Amino acid sequence: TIKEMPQPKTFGELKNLPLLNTDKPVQALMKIADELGEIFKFEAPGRVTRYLSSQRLIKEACDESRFDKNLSQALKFVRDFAGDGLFTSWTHEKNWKKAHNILLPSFSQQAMKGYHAMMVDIAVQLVQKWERLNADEHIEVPEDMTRLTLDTIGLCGFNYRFNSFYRDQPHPFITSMVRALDEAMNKLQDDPAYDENKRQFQEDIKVMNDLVDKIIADRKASQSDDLLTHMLNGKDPETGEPLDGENIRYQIITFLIAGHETTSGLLSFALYFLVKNPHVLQKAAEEAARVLVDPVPSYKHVKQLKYVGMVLNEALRLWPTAPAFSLYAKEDTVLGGEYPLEKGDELMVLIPQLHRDKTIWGDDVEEFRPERFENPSAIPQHAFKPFGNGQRACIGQQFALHEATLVLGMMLKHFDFEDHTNYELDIKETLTLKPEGFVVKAKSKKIPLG
Amino acid sequence: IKEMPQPKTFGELKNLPLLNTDKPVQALMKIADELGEIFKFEAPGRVTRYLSSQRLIKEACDESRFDKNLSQALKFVRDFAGDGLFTSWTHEKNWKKAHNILLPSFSQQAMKGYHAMMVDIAVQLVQKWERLNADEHIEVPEDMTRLTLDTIGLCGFNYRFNSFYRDQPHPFITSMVRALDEAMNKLNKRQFQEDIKVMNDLVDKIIADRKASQSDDLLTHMLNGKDPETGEPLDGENIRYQIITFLIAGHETTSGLLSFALYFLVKNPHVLQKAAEEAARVLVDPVPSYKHVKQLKYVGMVLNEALRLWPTAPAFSLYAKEDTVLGGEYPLEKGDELMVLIPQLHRDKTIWGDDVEEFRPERFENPSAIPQHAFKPFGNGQRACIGQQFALHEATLVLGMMLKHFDFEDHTNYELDIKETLTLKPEGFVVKAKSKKIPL
């Protein structure tokens, strides 16, 4: 029953590390997985981790009684500015449970329609921007999606307006965030040239915290019942204390980052797949048209864009924008009845590979067909993990899906899209996935919003 | 006969060391304060005579004796504006031609066609200000320029510059600004030939766009329109000069006007109260209707007084058609140049009284009581501003919505600093706006 774990061989003392010398490490890992199978050990100096690609093993990895969320080296680098926020704290860190309990009601389905109006504000800003384009012009999809998602999390979460649509370049916070996370992902592979880039990592951390100070200072000046309000007032009395200021600043950074990037990616990929599959686009457009009948979409009409939701879930299947998460083995145990694991050992869920499991999805894994999600309960458990797992799963999942569904819905409702460049897919990696350089032309239906 | 007053001369330099400045009109205003209603000004190779009194200017505005002159500035603008309406001689074929062809485009029939689009850009402005955080403030002439440029773009050529989707000025604006810093640099090679590149980015984009698709706007008349005297066309070359012309002339001065108007309103709180009251009482529709804009009488008066104190097109030039005598005192030979120094004119105490520096819109309660040729911010005669009603309509609509939707605050106690670039603007002018929170 015991077996030997597959591994790409070493580069002497660098071990396996020089293989992730690329703009696209996750995709490279995807081919390694295609070659070596459901599981392979990957060694870097001082670090060992095991990549899982099959549902059979991952369903085991998701047993919370045997495995807990691990802070990967990447997450440990992000913690330099995310601190002990929800995303970068250990499960058994006190402030994790404290902040989890305090912030969880802010992601109840109650709060979601407190958020709805504010979501509609930003969505309308996007629609208006596209309506106002001249014929020559085209849409830079992931850029505008980023504008929308960041403004949305800013407004709903902290009553703060980034005003991303009043800028033809990315917002300063965005530039600094992307630079601080591509930098962290650069540290994944201490020399002095790296002194100098550390100086730039401190500067972009500074810039993100200037903004945070603007959100706090703005909150001083006015009455809100949003995420920030719960962070200041909210109380967990298992602990009996409010989140102290430092942690609140970490949570603000955390939610600003996590609460926009992956969703921007998701919307981007979804539009891409829609224009690459014209019929799916027609069907989705039909649903959007039949359902979104109010000048601005109410909430409850957003909830039966079921086919839109399925489209988004399929987009998440093929290219999960948060493409991986790490776990550690609590105690000595055996995985899959074949691979023995010592306490502390790391596992990495290679999510796109998992989602390409032919054992689960059939042989047509590479094709885009949303109807896979017609009967969700047929899908084996732990087979679909775009939002992580268990008690450490994405708290903003409902937020992301509602926003994405609302926006994609209004998009399909208000515009016809055209792949005027016959765009060739090119995926950029920055701990998250995005279709870089993706552009389209949109010709308006001319339905007003009022 | 009498001898014409003149500032001291410095040998070959003549009067030139007296205009060593970034702000010539204001310096000339001081010179006028010193020498009175008329003075000759000599620079090497150039002589012009500056007029400041209504008495003399009403004579200067006699079209049978004086015609529009292209000052050196206008002559340099002519390098990219060519023989468009603003930079062509009256006796050039294309002036009368294009004037006849384009004149109906600024009748009131066309004017309420424009209203909806004006409201479009205006709403974009209001929305921008509604969406500012508490930290933030407004850069007034920058946003006014965004709005005026977008408005003339949409109304004129059905093209959206989308200036409010940029946190920086549109490329055309920057290029234009050094196209006129150019005019006075002449007092950079082909990076000015380059600002010509970009201004015709603009032009080629607008032509190709009109090509690509029911519009009947300025561009439409430029294309179809024809001259009932000659029956001859604006040739393509001239059409592009006219497009440039209307984009330039049709935005900067209006932006300036709105800027100065807001400035004077925040420096004079009671006037702000009355104007705001009119705006609130009249603008009752979610978006302002056409004829309600026409009932913003006090806002119109505010704008007129702002033009009185600082006319954004602050001067214009004339030449003597034939030998003649001016004011029965100063003989002029054919070709001699005159300059109407408009702000001084608007500060003539024989006309407006002794408190000329005060901002009082109520001066314009009865516009027809005001003597003629006393108020000339839009030039004179057949060479007067063709875009006058357009500018005033936009400005009234916009100022009205501004007063209706916001309370304004001079949070820096801004000290007026007027920048001159063929036009006037209050540079660095900033305010804070607190929303009344009235929806649109």
Ligand code: HEM
């Ligand atoms: C397409 C959209 C999104 C995707 C694909 C996504 C994906 C994920 C994944 C995979 C994790 C697990 C990370 C790990 O286990 O290491 C996670 C956690 C998390 N996500 Fe998201 N997410 C999305 C949207 C959002 C939004 C909109 C928010 C906030 C408004 C958010 C906030 C969070 C937080 C706070 C955690 C960690 C919570 C905890 O550990 O207590 N996410 N997400």
Ligand code: HEM
């Ligand atoms: C407050 C706003 C404005 C002011 C103060 C202003 C001022 C003037 C002045 C002083 C002249 C005469 C120039 C000279 O005699 O050398 C003029 C002419 C002209 N203006 Fe305006 N202007 C304004 C707005 C506009 C607008 C909005 C447009 C177009 C949409 C426009 C287009 C023109 C044109 C084409 C001429 C040349 C007239 C001709 O020779 O047929 N202006 N303007």
